[PDB]
Design an enzyme around this catalytic site. Sequence first.
Site, short mmCIF file in Angstrom:
data_model
loop_
_atom_site.label_atom_id
_atom_site.label_comp_id
_atom_site.label_asym_id
_atom_site.label_seq_id
_atom_site.Cartn_x
_atom_site.Cartn_y
_atom_site.Cartn_z
N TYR A 1 -0.92 -13.66 3.61
CA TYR A 1 -1.38 -13.55 2.24
C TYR A 1 -1.62 -14.91 1.57
CZ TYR A 1 -0.54 -8.49 2.39
OH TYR A 1 -0.61 -7.15 2.69
N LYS B 1 1.44 0.19 5.30
CA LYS B 1 2.58 -0.50 4.72
C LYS B 1 3.87 0.30 4.93
CE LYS B 1 -0.24 -2.81 1.18
NZ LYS B 1 -0.41 -3.04 -0.27
N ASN C 1 1.71 1.24 -2.28
CA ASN C 1 0.43 1.94 -2.31
C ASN C 1 -0.12 2.14 -0.90
OD1 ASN C 1 -0.39 -0.61 -1.70
ND2 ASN C 1 -1.90 -0.77 -3.38
N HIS D 1 -3.07 -1.54 3.10
CA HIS D 1 -3.89 -2.72 2.84
C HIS D 1 -5.22 -2.60 3.54
CE1 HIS D 1 -4.96 -7.04 2.85
NE2 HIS D 1 -5.49 -6.71 4.01
N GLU E 1 -8.16 -12.13 8.23
CA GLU E 1 -7.07 -11.19 8.42
C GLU E 1 -7.04 -10.63 9.83
OE1 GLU E 1 -7.30 -8.27 5.32
OE2 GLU E 1 -6.85 -9.79 3.77
#
Lengths: 141, 141, 141, 141
Positions: free
Chosen positions: D50, D10, D116, D119, D130
Amino acid sequence: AVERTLIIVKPDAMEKGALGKILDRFIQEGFQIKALKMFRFTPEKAGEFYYVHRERPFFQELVEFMSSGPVVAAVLEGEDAIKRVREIIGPTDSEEARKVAPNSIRAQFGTDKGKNAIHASDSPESAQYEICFIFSGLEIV
Amino acid sequence: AVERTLIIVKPDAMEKGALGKILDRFIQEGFQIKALKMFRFTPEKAGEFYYVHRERPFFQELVEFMSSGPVVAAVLEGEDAIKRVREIIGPTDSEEARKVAPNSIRAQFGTDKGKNAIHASDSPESAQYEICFIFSGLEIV
Amino acid sequence: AVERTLIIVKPDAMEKGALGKILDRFIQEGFQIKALKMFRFTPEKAGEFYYVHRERPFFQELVEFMSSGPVVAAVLEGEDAIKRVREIIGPTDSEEARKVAPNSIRAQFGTDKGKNAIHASDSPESAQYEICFIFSGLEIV
Amino acid sequence: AVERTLIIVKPDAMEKGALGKILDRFIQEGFQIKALKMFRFTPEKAGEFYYVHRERPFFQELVEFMSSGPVVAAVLEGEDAIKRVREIIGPTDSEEARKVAPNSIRAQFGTDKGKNAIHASDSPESAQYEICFIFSGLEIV
């Protein structure tokens, strides 16, 4: 000036598991990664990539090796990138790299003069050709 | 000499359903399609592609239009391709194209001087830039 | 229901210069082209795409043919697309297509039951596999 | 069984310069990198990626963050990859990761529950969706 250069992590360094360590080194040396891709050269496409080298020694050996397994290319951007990346990677002969530049990419991950871990563009003209061979402008981000 | 040039079928012609007829024309005129794809310019990427026009009239409208929906680009290869493709597409102003070149791409599918169906590279140097902007060497087959 | 299906224009139709006419037909039949590109299957990739046929007659010839030159794939979207696209392309055997569906893609551009111009997905599940094989979600626009 | 999962590094971890260290960790944990790409999600494409999460908390925040700068995706292949990669990355809350798994990716490079670092696919079904969202079969090598 701020410049862009192309690196390709060769199948020897890929198989040694060195990809992440190599990318980390360039990040820590202050380069921005502007494009990044794992792909497999066909023999024909490796031959086209190395069109200029087609008269230089070891053309067929290079083309065969560079199409023998997947590789990862990256565009690196930063001040004096072409020359600085060449300094970081070290001498073409990995054995010589270990003697004169022990923390260079080729000293750390290269085996010899052929299996020498990594390619980098050798000039502004080569960088322009090589970057466009692998990445379109749409892939720069 | 054999040359490569870039065409882009613009969103007006896309919406008119003319893509296939346009590709057919270039095939029948003797060009080899060396690369082809559908993509969508972001406004930023359209602006970079058209960076030469940044200070010219209607630049913002050009960028918005060219990023307003998907487009299709192709690399065309053939003898004298850059000039011949510009003769086939006709004058920028689609109305003028209908007057002087009724079977040109812009006469057939262009609305006006802005929504004019198709882009083609102007020169060898702009073709080189534009082809690399859209397609890597790996995409030329 | 609205569906997506994959077509591939095969090297026979590519060499015949039929790509644009084929795309035009699907546009005029009311389908949205959601993705499009020209690429070249390696023999390995063609074999994986056609893995279901691995034990069937002429599999090796299929793989060689489909990797013998560039192809163009498209994702087509529309109501009842999977069945409607198969009706438009006609019977596998191009000769039978000329007998029963003279304006079908295979009747118009297909040579025989092997060099039959075009591939289309058979079913929803095969469309899902085949679309993902050729195009990522990032390429659907 | 040998499985494939998707990771995406990310923008927070990208900006921290952690990409290489993160890839190295997965290589050293025994995973094969089968595909790798730096790209920029448009907001629309992040929203589509998403799609499933669109009802879960923080959808808009996630979509905005994941389209706010470039990211790097990789397909990781290995025994029990989906679960093992989740173990390596640690708890969603980076602060909690530091308490219970100090050498996890999120402990090492994550800031909080939103920034964070990384993913990873959360299940076989998610991994299938995905991976195809980001990479075609042609990009697997």
